[PDB]
RNA sequence: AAGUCUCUAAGCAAUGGAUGUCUUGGCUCCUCACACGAUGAAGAACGUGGCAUAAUGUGUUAAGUAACCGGAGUUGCAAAC
RNA sequence: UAUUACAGAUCCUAAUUGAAGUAGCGAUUAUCCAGGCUUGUAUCCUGGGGGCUGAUGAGGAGUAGGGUUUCUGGACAACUU
RNA sequence: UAGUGUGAACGAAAGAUGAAAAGAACUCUAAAACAGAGGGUGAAAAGUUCCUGAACUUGCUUAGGGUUAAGGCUAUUUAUAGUACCCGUCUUGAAACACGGAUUAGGGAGUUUAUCUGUAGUGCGAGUCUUUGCACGUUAACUGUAAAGGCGUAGAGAAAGC
């Protein structure tokens, strides 16, 4: 996998990662920026995103996205409800916090989200739409890989 | 079909028994990897032209 | 320097002949020296290895053990031995291959062909050392 | 007109499997385009010297012919 | 007079397969040979191995059998000798 | 001694950006409610409404062509916008 | 070979784990052959189209700039002053509203043969060349050598004759 760190201990830090999860990159990066929030309370944010009570702000990847009211708290008006991204960050943070019995000398309740790092991965899957005049364009987005670390605010 | 000849039927037999996955034990024997069965096809995609 | 034209001195040709030799030449290529107890007895240094006899390796993880040859392998070009085993992470011993030219032969078992080979090389070694004059 | 609609009624077969070639045997004209069956001589031209050596000797098994090469190695070596 | 935006640099990564090192493959020159076939050739098709689709052996004696010459397991698992 | 120095050739081959989470997801009657199976179904099945096709019918069957698409069981990495 | 065309024909991409598979047991979260996290193997994860792993593009972290599209050059107390049109190309004339140019890597174009010309170097010199070939050889080389032959040593003329 590899990981990347800055003023973080290896021994005290709860880790989790994926490779090749079939979800869009640009919304996955944008949720991850917002997350750097105690983990238990960060899940309560991402469950509100699932039912569409609170939104995820799009600063970087915003082109064509219209304005909304639930932007107001973040500042950004371009702000939407990526549900499928919010499923993964729940099911990664929950799996990271199953290093309670491993890795002692870290309390589980008062943990911060230290680190998130999304990027694009190898295209395993290939498909193409046939279009006019025998022209065959692609129709397959690149899949992601994601990299969380959680730690108490002592590092 | 129907009304196929016999030597037509002989070719269609050989074309379907040859269509299968490669066996597992050749990769175990030779240790080569990434050999595909060349005479694999799909009926809808590639026609035989026989 | 070689005089015979028909043998080649290119590295491409020799490796190709070596790896794709016939079966009889590969058995001769798989060979080892005897221990000095057996050298004075039989009167030869060098012999090809069989599944009967046992062998003793200096230098390794498996340093200085005797053990019988379970299997010769001519394609893989190495020798399996009894005793010479690391376990897997599973509780399962697996025999570990070693090339015979690292190894000394400690005991030998006779065959009509093995006795017939030894009596040739004994008589050959008596002629050659008389010629050179040692 | 001359494209997609007129591809519809294309169901007849111009060429059929050929006995000698086994490959393009013309049913109406009754000749193998690739090999020339049934002419007793087999079809090749010096303008298709590339395509000829795909068909010609070496490509197949050579069951009788490989053992007659192997004799001539032994006699001269 | 705001910036998580945009621009530049460095460090650690993702993507990608350049560079460097390897080489049982080519290319050419020289040598020797050409003794294919109605005693069924070259070429094609299909069979056949314990797990074998291609290729390679081989033809219901079908990964072979007999004789002579080599002479001890020419590879994963299974089985026999 | 040479197949000896690249930014261009609408150069060649190989990979990759912005545009862009944008254009767009068409055509075909019409879906709704409770159950079953499940980690998970408006979609897979059952039952009940509401509809469509409306004998040149997305009905039942054949030439030519396709060649196992037929049938039962298990499976969802991919494909069936 | 894959694959294309009714057909004659056409025709790719694709090498490298490690010395040895020692190819990752068992446990935990999970619906789970999803995906990780512990723990181990090995000298080193090099962890299965796996040696080295460049550039373009991207992510995270750290540091600054931003009304002047950005970049460059000169000067210093480092954010100011002055300066600065986009390269290549045919053209009398290109920043041109002339054409080529989205990015990056790797390929990518005055070479060789014959018959000659002239200059310079080298050896012999009214000579010079040893090669077709023969004899040698630690053998395509190198070495030795007989005789012809080439060009030079005499020219003018259509030619006889000179």
Number of strands of chain D: 2
Number of strands of chain C: 8
Write down the oligomeric state.
part of a larger assembly
Q: What is the first-to-last residue Cα distance of chain C?
A: 24 Å
Provide key terms for this protein.
part of a larger assembly, 4 chains, C: 134 residues, alpha+beta, four-stranded antiparallel β-sheet, two-stranded antiparallel ribbon, D: mainly alpha, 26% helix, elongated, RNA-binding, ribosome, Trichomonas vaginalis ribosome, rRNA
Explain this structure to me?
Chain A is α+β, with helices and mostly antiparallel strands and 155 residues long. Helices cover 25% and strands 21% of the residues of chain A. In chain A, the strands form 4 sheets. Chain A has a 3-stranded antiparallel beta sheet. Chain A has a two-stranded antiparallel sheet with strand order 2-3. The two termini of chain A are 22 Å apart. Chain B is an all-alpha fold. Chain B is 36% helix and 0% strand. Chain B is built from 2 helices and no strands. Chain C is of the alpha+beta class and 134 residues long. Helices cover 33% and strands 25% of the residues of chain C. Chain C contains 4 helices and 8 strands. In chain C, a hairpin with a 4-residue loop joins strand 4 (66-73) and strand 5 (78-81). The longest helix of chain C has 21 residues, at 112-132. Helices cover 26% and strands 5% of the residues of chain D. Chain D has helices spanning 49-55, 63-75; strands at residues 15-16, 25-26. Classes of the chains: A alpha+beta (155), B mainly alpha (50), C alpha+beta (134), D mainly alpha (77). The chains hardly touch. The structure holds 3 RNA strands. Chain B: Belongs to the eukaryotic ribosomal protein eL39 family. Chain B: GO terms for molecular function: structural constituent of ribosome. Chain B: Keywords: Ribonucleoprotein, Ribosomal protein. Chain B: Pfam families: Ribosomal_L39.
């Amino acid at each position: 996998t590899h990981y990347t760190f800055s003023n973080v201990e290896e021994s005290k830090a709860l880790k989790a990662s994926t490779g090749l999860e079939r979800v869009h990159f640009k919304p996955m990066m944008e949720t991850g920026r917002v997350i750097k929030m105690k983990a238990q309370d960060a899940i309560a944010y991402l469950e509100a995103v699932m039912r569409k009570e609170r939104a995820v702000p799009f600063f970087r990847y915003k082109g064509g996205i219209s304005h909304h009211a639930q932007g107001h708290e973040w500042g950004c008006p371009t702000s939407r409800w990526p549900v499928k991204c919010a499923e993964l960050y729940i099911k990664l943070i929950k799996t990271a916090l199953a290093g309670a019995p491993q890795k002692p000398g870290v309390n589980v309740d008062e943990v911060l989200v230290a680190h998130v790092q999304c990027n694009r991965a190898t295209q395993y899957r290939w498909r193409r739409i046939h279009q006019a005049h025998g022209r065959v364009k692609s129709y397959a987005s690149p899949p992601t890989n994601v990299q969380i670390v959680l730690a108490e605010k002592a590092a | 079909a129907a009304h196929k000849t016999l030597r037509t039927k002989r070719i269609l037999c050989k074309a379907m028994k040859v269509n299968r996955p490669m066996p597992q034990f050749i990769r175990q024997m030779t240790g080569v990897r990434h050999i595909r069965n060349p005479l694999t096809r799909h009926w809808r995609r590639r026609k035989m032209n026989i | 320097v070689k005089t015979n034209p028909f043998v080649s001195s290119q590295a491409r040709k020799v490796r190709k002949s070596y790896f794709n030799a016939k079966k009889d030449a590969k058995h001769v290529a798989m060979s080892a020296p005897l221990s000095k107890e057996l050298q004075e007895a039989n009167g030869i240094k060098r012999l090809p290895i069989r599944r009967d006899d046992e062998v003793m390796i200096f230098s390794g993880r498996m340093q200085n053990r005797t053990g019988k040859v379970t299997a010769v392998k001519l394609s893989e070009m190495r020798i399996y031995v009894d005793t010479f085993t690391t376990e897997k992470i599973n509780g399962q011993a697996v025999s570990f291959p070693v090339h015979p030219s690292n190894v000394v032969i400690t005991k030998l078992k006779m065959d009509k062909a093995r006795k017939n080979l030894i009596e040739l090389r004994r008589l050959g070694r008596d002629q050659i050392l008389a010629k050179l004059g040692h | 007109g001359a494209g997609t609609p007129s591809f519809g009624p294309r169901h007849n077969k111009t060429h059929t499997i050929c006995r000698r070639c086994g490959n393009c045997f013309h049913i109406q004209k009754s000749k193998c385009a690739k090999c020339g069956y049934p002419d007793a001589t087999m079809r090749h031209y010096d303008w298709e010297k590339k395509a000829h050596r795909k068909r010609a000797q070496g490509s197949g098994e050579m069951r009788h012919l490989k053992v007659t090469f192997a004799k001539l190695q032994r006699a001269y070596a």
